[PDB]
Write a protein that binds this ligand. Structure first.
Ligand SMILES: O=C([O-])C(=O)[O-]
Ligand SMILES: O=C([O-])C(=O)[O-]
Ligand SMILES: O=C([O-])C(=O)[O-]
Ligand SMILES: [Mg+2]
Ligand SMILES: [Mg+2]
Ligand SMILES: [Mg+2]
Lengths: 518, 515, 515
């Protein structure tokens, strides 16, 4: 029995490729898909974070929809303490990125009357009056509901749908009153305090970057975060408002645009051009559009990002039941697998790691599934199509990278070793989706952390001083990657790896060697 | 914003096909993927079953792991009452099949000290002793657990892992004592009564068809069920035993083999050729094999069933969260869409329809998702592959079927209408996975009910008596299909459809306008 | 072994398709590529023409660059006598088409002085060219007359001039007041009334000369089936020919001959205006560098296949058979690769008009074309042809359904009932392996069907029936008998039958066993 689905890899049709997928064909040790973990009460402590990292966390996500700067500053410090606790052995050190997820133009309800911790029951068919009068902002109940978007009545009409609390409650407007927004409860259910509101289709006029988002983004610059997940990006100019707030100081912070409503889907191309990457934010997306269409937008966005060479993240509810249970549902297992099969660079955990009872188990499961799914990719067709859908180029670095990927398929390489200052050389390889892991050796700490955005890049940070004679410094960076691979089980002595290097001291990568492991 | 993802249909690469998927491209009205609903307390009533059918239920599954013959007989009559409640309008009548899912070689624990509602906590690292002694069968607690598999000790050894309650609790064998199988709790969890036990990697020597299974199968023959879902099929031998029990009286009942353990995957090809169809039984399968590997087995089995032209069902936890909530998670929506993309003929609901609070909404969600995913199939590549990975016939019906599918892709027709007595002609069309719905006109009611196992077949049961003129009896059945398709919104007057009939072998194809 | 290269037919790659081509896999009896023969002194006797027909000739080409109307009228008369000599058995009768190949804008030298002897032109020698008619019968090695009075306006010092199928080349050395002056580059025996090419000159001769008008109107009176229009440079040339043919000749097919650089460059607009194309490699290889002709041939055949219009590969396919009874290996290669390229027809000129082995050359083209037809990689060809979209047109959908079915059941033929030919043409455009037996009652339809690959046209002279169903079966049975007599299939084989249903067009396909 061959390993890593290599028998299905040789199938001449996609149908026969499926027929050959073999549960007794073990995957390789390396896992190429990045795992982004939302950090929260269940995962904040240094000790848990050390375990989170050992279980495979690549990026810590902080959701500024909730929490104070004090809280998030402590979280980040704990993330950094846990991460740096492994620095004592640079062979086994893994950089861990920090990601700031903005609140964005959220609409929220007020507090339920009383203590504010209660819920009230909305009954199917009942009337619910929405009010903007702040006298009710802490007096919400089943008859009068307050919410924080003051211009709501200007963007809805009789017949407009309104969803509350993750889309669990639906209302249809039946009167725009003088002091009222009168609705009927279409889907009833329990209503707590400060729940999310979606106005599907409505031209919501909240700013893309609010005064609160400006504070969080500046805070993110001060805290040296590696990326921003910008909530509710509707258009290319929304990305500009994030970018100008990040300013010159934040010029190297990646802006991942979160697509979560119909306008963002419709304007995806202009958004993708303006962004450093994309998040398929399926939570709001499946409220904003019919939930049965989310997989279309997911596959469209992943496909276009692979085509553009830009990082794409699949997010929200992929292991949801593991908030309460130690094992995932069969739908959750196949959802993680299919996100990798679609071509997602990273997958994400929100409540599973932020507040659930089984954060470590959830991280470990994404690790296990992604590694199985990575072997089950039909590389033959994928690589054929990525080359064909790619231009011809005067760029030798492009030609070197595609040559390296092609060679790595031919000799079933244990890795592709790339020396890179900015990441670009490693990113160029990853865009061709080799099956071998891409060990990117860099001395730039930010490059190393940001590399998790790209499928297959295993970033190793070299802290050794620069060697005189650049020939000797190229070696002992290759050798550093050789020792990481052996220590991690990616390959052993006598295996073949591919090594990408330049011709002199950034963008001079032009040399591929097919090199045995010493 | 075009229709039914036809822009994505035109793409020259799968990557560009993905890039072209369009949330503003609306699917056709017809939904090709069959929906199987497990019936239970939440869905047993004639009132609910009528709504189940209205929401899109095609097959009623009865799980004989639980319940009595008297109980199941009442469920079955309710299904037929609700189904026939629509039989007065043959233009809108939908056949509903009945499926019997056997118990099979299940292992169960006993009752917690007291009731079936009591639970105890099992703590990580604690000792738990398993007993086969019936003195303990109603005195299970945190130290002693009874299960009903009398021979378990001759099948495990020290170091073996034992899973309880959907694999949520795991134990490791530490000693094989004289009266007690003593284990250490590995995964802690609350343990109730009568929970399923799994023994991955053990040669479980329970009979494939037990004495309970025989009387359930004979009952199914008496009750005129359309198909059997046979649990824990491990080898072709097991299928033959089910077919033997069904006997001559049940020779037309379809046997779907449920693949839920390692041996059934390893022996899949021989199980498939012995079987009429396959169920990817993901619940147990995910406990028997590492859960991260299930999608491999799912795609392997769907691919091989597509290759063989046999029905395949994807089952278990597709919309699990809708047992308690009125909308699925995003993983659940994705799971359903991807099963259809994978090529499954049918998708299934178990707890969502049997006992949860939103059985109707779960059926409607599978209906909505399946239909969106059917349009998102990359038919260009799929039709090319099914043709190449298919033998050369000499069979005139096979050639007519593939030509009809080819023609239907060319003239983007509203349906393929086929007159079939046995179903075979429609099955041969469905095996090539046309985009267009297949309206199979039959007078055989069992053919009508069993047609749901095949993707795309909309069975319509002609109740008219036969006309003397065969040429006129053909037109009467064809025009009945035209009225069905117009009443249901599949196409309208002037649209183009494909019509498959015989010469008094289904061997003639007509491209005709809807009148 | 397998037959008709079916083992190579199911290869997954073109490379493996080549690897499986098998000299021991014999082809089917039917030959799909049309054979066009230039009728001339070696081939216009009634008795020879009978043997041409029996050897495989489908179209008689008459080259109006030479001969008088009276001479050509007799040739047409003899062709029709030979052809109708087989009408006494309607089952073995093959329609034979008559094609009129125009003179077009030719340039010709005058007569060698007497008495058509030849003079030797020597490399390096001087040769004066005159336009003075005083010299038109006194050409020799020193002075040569030609009939293009405006030649001095379109050439210059340095211009190259080619005489006698490009075998003799001259370079212009001065333009005198009278007598252009020239040096011989390639020497050779110069005979009388030889053809002249001026590659890259704006030769302003009319597309349709007064002589062409007479010849075209002669063609109408003689009821010819098609016109091969020489030296078509642009769409408006095609329009000129069509206008001269006018209303009386409106059913005559116009095949444009692509013979120079301008015709290649403007190919698309010429193809659009034309009924089909001839790759006139003789002139074309003088007008453009000979090493580029295969580029223009493959381009033109590819675009004609893409457009569904007939294309003829012509000139020097079996040249050495003018004098020897066997072709060279390049000639065998040339014919095969023309068929593999996709040519609807292949042509003979001197091999049949004036050579010593006209029958052997016809038979060689028949033998090669049939081997090459089996070697076509139909899997790729059909996939790619299909990939061009699904039009509402139900005749198109039926045609592609029939071709797909014919691949599936390896049918002995596709039988098509057609008045105008169109349904049969639509089938041929998808290039089935099986022969297409087009049953028509129109004799011109039957003769023009030869322009489309694979159409074996049969002329039904049985009377119409009042019962449409009976009239269909009569014509289908006639095609069955034709196929049985010709060895295409036999009792028990399977054929595909394309018909209309109650005439109102071709929307019915049946997969039918041969009785
Ligand atoms: O904000 C998110 O992550 C979402 O909606 O999925
Ligand atoms: O038996 C079943 O249905 C399962 O385990 O999924
Ligand atoms: O006219 C022709 O036959 C040629 O030039 O090949
Ligand atoms: Mg969101
Ligand atoms: Mg089970
Ligand atoms: Mg010529």
């Amino acid at each position: 029995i061959q390993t890593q689905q290599l028998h299905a890899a040789m199938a001449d049709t996609f149908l026969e490729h499926m027929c050959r997928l073999d549960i007794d064909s073990p995957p390789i040790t390396a896992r190429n898909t990045g795992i982004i973990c939302t950090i929260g009460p269940a995962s904040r402590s240094v000790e848990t974070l050390k375990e989170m990292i050992k279980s495979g966390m690549d990026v810590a996500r902080l959701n500024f929809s909730h929490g104070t700067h004090e809280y998030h500053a402590e979280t980040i410090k704990n993330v950094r303490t846990a991460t740096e606790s492994f620095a004592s052995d640079p062979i086994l050190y893994r950089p861990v990125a920090v990601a700031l997820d903005t609140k964005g133009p959220e609409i929220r309800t007020g507090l339920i009357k009383g203590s504010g911790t209660a819920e009230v029951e909305l009954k199917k068919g009942a009337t619910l009056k929405i009010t903007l009068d702040n006298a009710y902002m802490e007096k919400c109940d089943e008859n009068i509901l307050w919410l924080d978007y003051k211009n709501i009545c200007k963007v809805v009409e009789v017949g407009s749908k309104i969803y509350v609390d993750d889309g669990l409650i639906s209302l249809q407007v039946k009167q725009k009153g003088a002091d009222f927004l009168v609705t009927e409860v279409e889907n009833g259910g329990s209503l707590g305090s400060k729940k999310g509101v979606n106005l599907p289709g409505a031209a919501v006029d909240l700013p893309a970057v609010s005064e609160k988002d400006i504070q969080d983004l500046k805070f993110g610059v001060e805290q040296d975060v590696d990326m921003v997940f910008a909530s509710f990006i509707r258009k290319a100019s929304d990305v500009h408002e994030v970018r100008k707030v990040l300013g010159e100081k934040g010029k190297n912070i990646k802006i991942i645009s979160k697509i979560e409503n119909h306008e963002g889907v419709r304007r995806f191309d202009e958004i993708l051009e303006a962004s450093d990457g994309i998040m398929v934010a399926r939570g709001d997306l499946g409220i904003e559009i019919p939930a049965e269409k989310v997989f279309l937008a997911q596959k469209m966005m992943i496909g276009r990002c692979n085509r553009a060479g830009k990082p794409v993240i699949c997010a929200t509810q992929m292991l949801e039941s593991m908030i309460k249970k130690p094992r995932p549902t069969r739908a959750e297992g196949s959802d993680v697998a299919n996100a990798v099969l679609d071509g997602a660079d990273c997958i994400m955990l929100s409540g599973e790691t932020a507040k659930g009872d089984y954060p470590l188990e959830a991280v470990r499961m994404q690790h296990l599934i992604a590694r199985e799914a990575e072997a089950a990719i039909y590389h033959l067709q994928l690589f054929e199509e990525l080359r064909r859908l790619a231009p011809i180029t005067s760029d030798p670095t492009e030609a070197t990278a595609v040559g390296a990927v092609e060679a790595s398929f031919k000799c079933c390489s244990g890795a592709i070793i790339v020396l890179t200052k900015s990441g670009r050389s490693a990113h160029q390889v990853a865009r061709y989706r080799p099956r071998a892991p891409i060990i990117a050796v860099t001395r730039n700490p930010q490059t190393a952390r940001q590399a998790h955005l790209y499928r297959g890049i295993f970033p190793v940070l070299c802290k050794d001083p620069v060697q005189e004679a650049w020939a000797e410094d190229v070696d002992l960076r290759v050798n550093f990657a050789m020792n990481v691979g052996k220590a991690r089980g990616f390959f052993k002595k006598g295996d073949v790896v591919i090594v990408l290097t330049g011709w002199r001291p950034s963008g001079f990568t032009n040399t591929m060697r097919v090199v045995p492991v010493p």
